[PDB]
Design a binder for this molecule. Structure first.
Ligand code: CLR
Ligand code: CLR
Ligand code: CLR
Ligand code: CLR
Ligand code: CLR
Ligand code: CLR
Lengths: 207, 207, 207, 207, 207, 207
């Protein structure tokens, strides 16, 4: 493991990419990876047996948990992270494939066309990344009204005869980790807008 | 780890393979791997103790779970993934073996024949991949009428004296992950049809 | 990780080995590895607490489980896999050792003798592999009359005062995975017979 | 794995960095990593079921645990460690990116400017590291009045009808590991002040 | 991973070592590693909660388990394996150190002396390995009269008021795995005697 | 993985280090690593639920366990091992840093001074290692009067109304593993004294 190799892996042999992404976006993406895995290993965990409802009836607790938290925070962040990654992986594959084609041509203008098409691919990939980030932020807003978790809820549903007051397990730390992940996603959003506009302005300067 | 090595590993030193698979199919296959492992680690888990049936009788819960969910979603996707992989692995082995034979010949026309047989092998492998995907989609349709999971079921079987209303653990997220996996499989299906027809059309153009 | 390295590792720098094993047997052996690990991680698991017997008496459940399933399917397949591997590992060690001896001779006819003895070693190793496969198939037949698992059993043994009807946990999926593993083992058996007879016929053709 | 590679990875190809950090800070940071992971694997663990409150009422124990320990020690140290790392990772990315730009220039004064800007980046990164360390120490002081853990607490909150005397699981070892981590963080603080002042004094000596 | 590297790692750049060990002992040692890890992961497991004694009194079960099985089979095999390994590791270190000394001499008869001392070291190491194997076999004989495990035991000790009939969890498979490990250890014993006597006879032939 | 690389990693490119450490201390340190991890995975485990006290009152068992075993054996050995390692890691960092400085000088007597300072660093590091070992042995003596574990204890503390006789889980194997670890630490102590005195005597011989 060396820093040149790690940097190249994060970048992807993309000569069109600017410093902004290459350094800052790679760094904060690694930060997202770290915070995502440590927190899931640490606080949410199974995040089902921790949820406690005062009812002796079997099954009421699970139904009630399901009602109040349809999709978990950590699974949503993991899905967001994979879906964000796929565009960048696609661009890296495109460049790796194109250089291989060039090599096979050598073994047995056009180069300018290759350059231009790669530029367009990179721009569209960054746009898709931005769109995914924004959509996931909107889903977060829709699912949970507020950043802080709710400690006390009332549970009036089948098969629970009376409304039962029911409690969440570890709200305070989930709030902190939620804030961290949300801030990381926002930073990514602004970085991506800045990167796209920078590319367009540089292209205008060239012509 | 470098992008050239990863790209070559995903492709397999197959000069006949087109850009379509090499880039897009590799990317979405990696996506399938990621979504499969994260979700199993996260939501399904043991996926047996989570299932709750209102009966104090021991064994009725397990019998009832077995009746309603013969084969799990995640195990079925994992089996599908392995079985899909085996054709591509076979083709990669074929090419690696043939180059070794060529080298041993060098140490101590035919080349054209090698090329043609490799082309035929690749086409048949892609066809087998398509067939496996379609068969697994059909099995999904047969096993579960609808994409959304059933929350409430009635359980009238031995050794359960009365029909017991019985509940599933985490349906909402299982629905989302089911949709993601199904969409990935469908994308693979269309990609594979397109790749095969592209190869045939290119061969026709050559002659 | 590259395909040439993986292919060489699976083969073992054995110039006498034919295409049959090198490609097909390596592929289906990798398939056996994958199916063995995924299924054990997934369905059998601890495969003891899942077994449920209707008796409140402590210890009767474990005694009864032990009576009906002396050796588990997955442990038996794992043992089979290790024992099958050891011959091939032995042959790989033999070739690696012999090339080292040749190098030390260089540093400080016979070559033909080396070739012949290596050929004989390979043939005997393949024969041993075939024998191990057949023996394990016979043990499977002896232990379990049928491929499908038994859901309901009657348990009349100490310290269980009455015969208790007792249930298996997840039979339907265990049946499917059993079929997959058995088919893989059979394919290996036929491949091995074919490989040995091919070597003998080629030797006859040479002379 | 070799010592030159590990040393370069810890340092980051930063010619401006002094011996102080390169050796001592790398060593004690590795020590922090080791102590953090071993202790979490060992003593804190799930650190929730271990907490015992004398109440048969379900949910009172979790509410009470949450009140007394809002954020765990180990999660706080892990977050501190990630957040401390991010600056150094950023500087390593900056240098790796700049050398790549220089290479692309070669393929197709300024060098002095590159050197100076890298120096400024390193100084600011070390300052940020110091600030993060100090902030986390302050949070430790605020959250817990004393280094030693409290064995006995009184718990008078909803839904617990009477104040219940409630006990912590493993205080003595948590105290020891707390002391170790705190001492490591303090050593880092002093090292960082010394490194920054050394750089400034050396710059003054140069001019 | 390549076969030459694996073979060299197993051997240890020891020119005095004979074919016997280099191939066969390496192979069966790898077999011991595999069988040890798979079985522990699979059957013994925690091997404490599985043990069931018919007593409602808390603590009687653990005391009784401790009385009947002082040291587990799997831990004993693991300790045997580590202790067996240490001699071979020591010899490998000796040769690696001596070649480094020779290189440092080159940078700035005796060679014959180096050869002889290395030969003596190897012989004594093999003798120590044999002794460790024999001692561990004797301990196995002492601890357990027979290879087959005991299903039923009587437990008359404090704090258990009456002698309780108490049962073992999974005896049949433990018997099989015990036989496998014992056979491997015996094979190692004979191999080691043969290797030592072969070295001595070859030395006599030389002189 | 090769023996030269492993040997260099264990040694650390230290030309002043003698054969004694390089071979024997590396070997027995690897032995300490192995015995530490296997035993913790195997016998101690969670080492809390295994402890059984005859009291139905919740919390009395944990309080009593805490009183009798303030710090666990395995955590203490792990801490000892990390703390022992840090000096050697520091020396390795020092040498790696110094060679890098020499290279940067080459790119753009003193050498004798470098040699001498490195010698002094190595001697002081070995002394610190010896001191850490001795301190940890003393702590072992203080915490536990005897090597063998205590099976039966009496527990008279809050909130336990009567003194309860309370039992340890697996004493016999903990005794064996304790003896092994203690013997390893002692061997290290003697080795370290011998190494330091050997260096001093050799220096006297030089002058
Ligand atoms: C500027 C930022 C956003 C770039 C981030 C690029 C990241 C997402 C890229 C760089 C290298 C990639 C990894 C390369 C190799 C593997 C191993 C494979 O078995 C699963 C996917 C995985 C783990 C890839 C996931 C995506 C990845 C981590
Ligand atoms: C275009 C797409 C479908 C190509 C996908 C090819 C994938 C399935 C190939 C590429 C490299 C292959 C892997 C190469 C090495 C190993 C390690 C071995 O111990 C198990 C199998 C495993 C993990 C292989 C599984 C199949 C694999 C992942
Ligand atoms: C044609 C088919 C049957 C060939 C199959 C050969 C397989 C069984 C060989 C090829 C490489 C071998 C592996 C090489 C390295 C290791 C690592 C070691 O720590 C345990 C054994 C293990 C994992 C070997 C097991 C056997 C192995 C997997
Ligand atoms: C002087 C001290 C403070 C320098 C410490 C630098 C440390 C924090 C740097 C050096 C190399 C870096 C690692 C390089 C590679 C990876 C793998 C990646 O998948 C996650 C991050 C991770 C694990 C990095 C985390 C930060 C790291 C460990
Ligand atoms: C002929 C037979 C008996 C030779 C057997 C030699 C075996 C025991 C040797 C060969 C290479 C050695 C391994 C080399 C590297 C490591 C990694 C280290 O972190 C722990 C020890 C461990 C795992 C060694 C244990 C001993 C080992 C496995
Ligand atoms: C003669 C004896 C005492 C020498 C022992 C030196 C040992 C302690 C040295 C040699 C190589 C070192 C390892 C090198 C790399 C890593 C990976 C890192 O992520 C954590 C620390 C760790 C695991 C180091 C711990 C200390 C280490 C194991």
């Amino acid at each position: 493991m060396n820093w040149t190799g790690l940097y190249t892996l994060l970048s992807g042999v993309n000569r069109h990419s600017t410093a902004i992404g290459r350094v800052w976006l790679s760094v904060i993406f690694i930060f997202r990876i770290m915070v995502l895995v440590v927190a899931a290993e640490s606080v949410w965990g199974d995040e089902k047996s921790s949820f406690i409802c005062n009812t002796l009836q079997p099954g009421c607790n699970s139904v009630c948990y399901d009602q109040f938290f349809p999709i978990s925070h950590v699974r949503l962040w993991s899905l967001q992270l994979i879906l964000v990654s796929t565009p960048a992986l696609l661009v890296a594959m495109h460049v790796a494939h194109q250089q291989h084609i060039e090599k096979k041509m050598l073994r047995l203008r056009h180069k300018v066309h290759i350059s231009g098409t790669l530029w367009w691919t990179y721009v569209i990939s960054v746009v898709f990344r931005l769109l995914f980030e924004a959509v996931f932020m909107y889903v977060f807003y829709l699912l949970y009204p507020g950043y802080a978790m709710v400690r006390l809820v009332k549970c009036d549903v089948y098969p629970c005869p009376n409304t039962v007051d029911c409690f969440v397990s570890r709200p305070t730390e989930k709030t902190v980790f939620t804030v961290f992940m949300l801030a990381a996603s926002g930073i990514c959003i602004i970085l991506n807008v800045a990167e796209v506009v920078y590319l367009i302005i540089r292209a205008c300067a060239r012509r």
